[model samples]
Target: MRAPIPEPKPGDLIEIFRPFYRHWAIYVGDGYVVHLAPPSEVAGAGAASVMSALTDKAIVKKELLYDVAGSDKYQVNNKHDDKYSPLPCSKIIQRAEELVGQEVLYKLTSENCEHFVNELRYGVA
Candidate 1:
């Protein structure tokens, strides 16, 4: 489960522990985040928002929901959960900022036509 305001820092590498596999996303502070395109590729892959990638609601509800831990304030559209949680995306980001100068890692997959992999970005605090 995800912890509830702060998100992971810009340099944090989060390991999304999914049932079948893990996913990663590199944090880039200031509420802006990026991840490599995976599963499928649209004409403009990197141009879409995170939510736009979730064409499959089941994927979003199952694999994506439970494992997201880095960002405390993550709810696609900022929905509020009834109970309090610790790993809120907002909180994670706050905590990550504390670990400035440290590096973070994440994972991404390739799509058809052009297969790009291991595309990572770094952030400086």
Candidate 2:
């Protein structure tokens, strides 16, 4: 079992672990997190495709961290600066907030939550 998550600050990366994959997001404080997710998955469009990580247009969204994960386990993984320097927390939150509600292309191997969060962290996708 994993430890319970503490309060996350702005720019902190939150990762949700699933049976097959992991979902990522950036915490923007106020009990909210922003991430790229498929409309079908976020809109309660039935459990049509659990494999949403594959391919589908995704949108930046702000939601309660727990709501986004349901019963899945999650953790804070702000070790993004390990490979590349991360942007300032203010800038990262600003960029992510600006992209909220915007639809963007999502590819399994290319563009996904990791890509989106990474871009917010490093200003590169």
Candidate 3:
């Protein structure tokens, strides 16, 4: 659950999540929100491959990017692979910190997060 998006707007560069998988659903209003899904369980599975699949048919835009979502629990040593625990808000923030300065794909992630701090005083080098 998130804030309700405003009414009709022009195209703005943003990280979005769109439906891109086997099971489709009426989950979008104006194709604004980004959709996320697990990696394709096929021979080639990566950013390029996922992007390729979306482009092959020319049915949908190749703007959406699919990547790992949620916690770093999987990174913890000996973590169970068959289980998923809901991450706390603070933990989610902590995890997001790792990507604070990285260039994430515009479609599958937020373009300008509320937490981004671009200070020219000490610009990124």
Candidate 4:
């Protein structure tokens, strides 16, 4: 089992472990998270994020962390911090909010979830 969850801060990366795969999101504070919602998904559904691997699109959505996480365990990974530094928290939140409700061109073994949050934190540059 994963250890206790530390309080997530704005701009932190959240890795939610599902039965088959991990769902990724950016913690935008106030108990909210921003993640790429793969096409036609149900909250916390194991099959939801898997659809990203097939191809097509996913919408950028902002939702309560609880709603998205459902019954899954999660962590504040902030992965790749050894190599990549995260951008500012305020700016990350700003950018994430800006992309809300967007249908982004998504693909890649359903890896877009992490990539989406990474791009938000580290930027596209």
How high is each candidate's TM-score? 0.30, 0.74, 0.20, 0.74
Predictions in order: lDDT: 0.33, 0.73, 0.25, 0.74
Q: Whole-model lDDT, candidate 3?
A: 0.25
lDDT of 2 by residue, 12-98 (tens): 888877666778888887678998766543555555343553445667778987786773677888655678755888998999899
Candidate 1 vs candidate 3: the lDDT winner is: 1
Residue-wise C-alpha lDDT for candidate 4, range 20-125, written one tens digit per residue: 7778888897789988776544334446544344555677888888777773666788876678855788998999899887676664233778777788888862
Return the candidate ranking by lDDT, descending.
4, 2, 1, 3
> Against the hidden true structure, what lDDT does model 2 obtain?
0.73
After superposition of all CA atoms, the RMSD between model 3 and the true structure is 15.2
- Expressed as tens digits, the lDDT of each residue in 18-115 for candidate 3 is 34412111112233212222343333555554655552311111211112212211111112114432443234323333333233332322212211
lDDT of 4 at 70: 77
Worst 10 residues of 2 by lDDT: 46-55
- For model 1, how does the per-residue alpha-carbon lDDT over 1-125 read when each residue is reduced to its tens digit? 52432653443343344455444443545344333333333335455343476432111011233334443323232112233233545554554344333222222421210111112221211
**Residue 120 displacement in candidate 1 (angstroms):** 4.4
Q: Which is better, 3 or 4, measured by lDDT?
A: 4
